[model samples]
Target: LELRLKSPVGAEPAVYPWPLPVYHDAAHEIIETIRWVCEEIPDLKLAMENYVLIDYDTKSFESMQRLCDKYNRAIDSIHQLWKGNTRPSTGLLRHILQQVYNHSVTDPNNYEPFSPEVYGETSFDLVAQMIDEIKMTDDDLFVDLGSGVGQVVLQVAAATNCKHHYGVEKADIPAKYAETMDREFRKWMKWYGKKHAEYTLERGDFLSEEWRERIANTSVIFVNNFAFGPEVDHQLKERFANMKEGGRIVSSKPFAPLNFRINSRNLSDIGTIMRVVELSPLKSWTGKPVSYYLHTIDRTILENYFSSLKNP
Candidate 1:
């Protein structure tokens, strides 16, 4: 989003505009720069793809450019108003107004429905680091809740050679995309004549009662921060409770906001509000900035859950 302001009468040409007319021009330039960013940065495209905003059959580059223009206009108007001599000094007023404006245009709760893409470079790197920290092996099962497009599952299976990687997806579009991705990954591997580990995608709501039994045997559960809202948070708590001791649940964000009693076992400080939470029966293992909290569960229940797994 870009914002610009016109100078008020008698205001100095340089400072009167507040953020300066140059700044407004810079903001305009910045908005124009977004196109270059979208074109040059592959992550932006990946994110767009991963989130299903970009149709496989159609390109939305033009639409994105149009959206950028919309943001630019909104920001410019705000900037102009703020430059006025009568503007409020609290900054809170401007902040609140700007936020309201932003929310109105972009907030999913209000209007434009902004669902973020999971394919950012940082998020991908974090997933890789998390997998490495877990020391995932072929005997372990890695499952991703809200496995949109199955990027997490595909990455783990492709990189770690896990025995079984399962992705649970709620939406049919992403689920179907993940299934296609799984097939494509295997196909690509085969083309290179490489024998890579296989993975599975299940079409079921993670919040459903059926998934509790399905995921009972899973060793490592992966939850993306964006996916865990109140309803899913309750479902995760139930899943963790039902899983065997020693099993692990790795979540991208905190569950407390959702009112879940579960806590992260192995925590890693990845930066900002993002941390890795591990829930398991094992005592805490420490490494680097990674923080961990161990959740001790009943051993008998763990054994029972494992025993119920269907062997191929």
Candidate 2:
């Protein structure tokens, strides 16, 4: 109900809760501070209230699916009803988890398997802005590399029709979590009496050739490579560079410039030329303003950006 805002010149350093470094030069300096208050939204209260009356003994996928369906409908309802009129977090999951799982979803695990990219859910505010700014449409395809628990996947699906949304998660734990969400989405569509567009959740390493087509084909790609090391960053950059001319990449951290000289004769054209621009500003999990990098493949730079990428 109450909104808080802070404007400061010196960008605050990333602390325990606010960890992603930001650049005000690139992004609009809307706010340099943050705040977090809990509670309900427009239609969310209606669903949460209905859920309280459900039989406590009803314990089955069908019952749970139906409940989830109800909540999902209201969640979307708030989108239209409130539009940009609200800022509230639905505690319905935390509300129901106690009666069912008897635990909270606050369990945060920083898992690192093959790459240094730490596993954490990107805030909806961040993803929502990415979707809005990118102007995703039914004709476009969206891909999420290293999708964690299908938050971006399901939400993107709900937001845009996009040709198809592909989620690639390699880790077993989060991969399994994404799979469950994938099924839940399908079940929700049927239970809610609405059919959704094509959506595929791939459980495998994203850096594989099997995903090469989707990787290059998607118009909008979301990469949560926040904790990725320079080497891994280079690898992803190499792949994205060769994508189609209009492809756009959204990443938590800036590519930090390949620092490559295009005129270098040693490395010729591999279709690697990325223009990194600061997109809309967002707050990190730790309550600090962060910069989201927007990368566009500009072929004009190919004449100079010496690419060293070779075929796999």
Candidate 3:
């Protein structure tokens, strides 16, 4: 009952799944998806094999270790060459730019699509490393707010066994491109396994009553921490509120939503259900140093941290 591609390139076995019918039954669209991307994506063999490695139901120790290495390379090609940002390299992602650019996507607002207009990328290797350091499992859920072109979400989807992935991006152009890539990835993803994780996307501002609900359900959250305005800051007011104890929020910079007020210079009154778990550091491709923080929610400690500072 195993599904097979008898001749992926004429007399070559383009087999992806190994003797698994349930998985084969599910792998209905991947073949067509490959047909669509095969011509455009480079290193067809590596891409196909690696795609399965990420999607496979069971993996050897070797595959598990090598997956991030390859993803890092793909990300580097995409970011350094495709994006041209000076943040330096982190070994995975970027370059679908040419195809995306070819579309000549119009700005949702008719703005010139600001240069450095590009949002910085999170490292694919670093992200994978985080998943390992944090001890994520198939039961956990990963969410990325301000997701740019799906790099974090995509890499997380590939790196971790977390059952669900949700990403929200405020910009229309990046969201549109992410949709195209996500759609393509999913069309073929099911072919690799019978039981698999889900990837969901949301576009537009991350400020809303609905976002609160989404965060409540999230176990892990990511924020890029740049380009935020007062209006967005207003939304950040409750960004860290009501997270279930044990949940974690990762940010490109240390953040505290509850304490964010222009009038108050006092940082002590600003605190949340979450506390800084760590200030993790990494370097940019240009060799400059930088860091992101990991904040964890703890109901018991939240109140003790600021007992005298606030009226709450």
Candidate 4:
């Protein structure tokens, strides 16, 4: 089937092959972008509620194409308004994630705990906040260590100007899903005509020597490692040790203390290598507002400590 979308503002209409590349069934047929278009465009929403939605499949192709025209018009109108905006709204981000997740993760429950596999998610609001707070530029490179389904990496790439975003996951199930997530994310972003930074979803151990070098060079790193075991956290600290000064890490759990002191005894600790601050009002899939940590690699703290010790 051919889906021709008309523009309200006289721009050229967009045409797509029906049964969209990511389309599955009626339940998942209507994407979040279309649903949002319907929600914001009252005329289309009224028409859908009054006529089309009740018997969507029963309608003829011509009838559906007419609705598609309305849908296209709505999308065009919204896109015009969005042209001035830098990032998508939280609601829009949530919708995009839902649509992408629906298409990508066929088996959401395909996880086993103590297989050293734990599935934790960060919320869209927190991600938006991180984007605003971190203020990454084109000069920066971002990485999400232990990325599950590459969600955080996708969100950051969509919202930030980071030169390149990378999601590295070692798990079999999540890594496999990341492949589809990468594809579906690209397809859907194009479907919405949204732009995102370059990104790669790779299946690899972040602790590997290859990744250790990658981590050291990365300007920004995001990790939802709240539930990670101490051994993994310790290993991660070792990798962070090599990061250049001024590199930043945003994490669900703190790699160092907020009140970290550079002392003779704990001088070799990760706390001495970075400055950690707690950000409040951050949330995750857990439904509660939990705090997240922002760690900036700053050897100046240790330098100051040594200077004071020698002088005093």
Q: Whole-model Cα lDDT per candidate?
A: 0.48, 0.53, 0.53, 0.73
Q: What is candidate 1's TM-score against the reference? A: 0.47
TM-score winner? 4
Best by lDDT: 4
Clashing pairs in 4: none
Ranking by TM-score: 4, 2, 3, 1
For residues 124-145, could you state the per-residue lDDT of candidate 2 as single tens digits?
A: 5455566667888778888889
Question: Which candidate, 1 or 4, has the higher TM-score?
Answer: 4
Model 3, range 43-83, lDDT digits (tens) per residue?
A: 54444444643453322334423443344344345434445
RMSD of 2: 15.0
Q: Model 1: runs farther than 4 Å from truth? A: 1-120, 256-312
Candidate 4: stretches off by over 4 Å: 1-32, 38-87, 108-122, 282-287
What ranges in model 2 sit over 4 Å off? 1-122, 192-195, 256-272, 282-287, 304-312
**Residues 148-239, candidate 1, lDDT per residue (tens digit)?**
66667766766675788889888877676666566555533332223445688778887777777867888788776544567666666666
Local distance difference test, candidate 1: 0.48
Candidate 2 residue 302 Cα shift, in angstroms, is 2.8
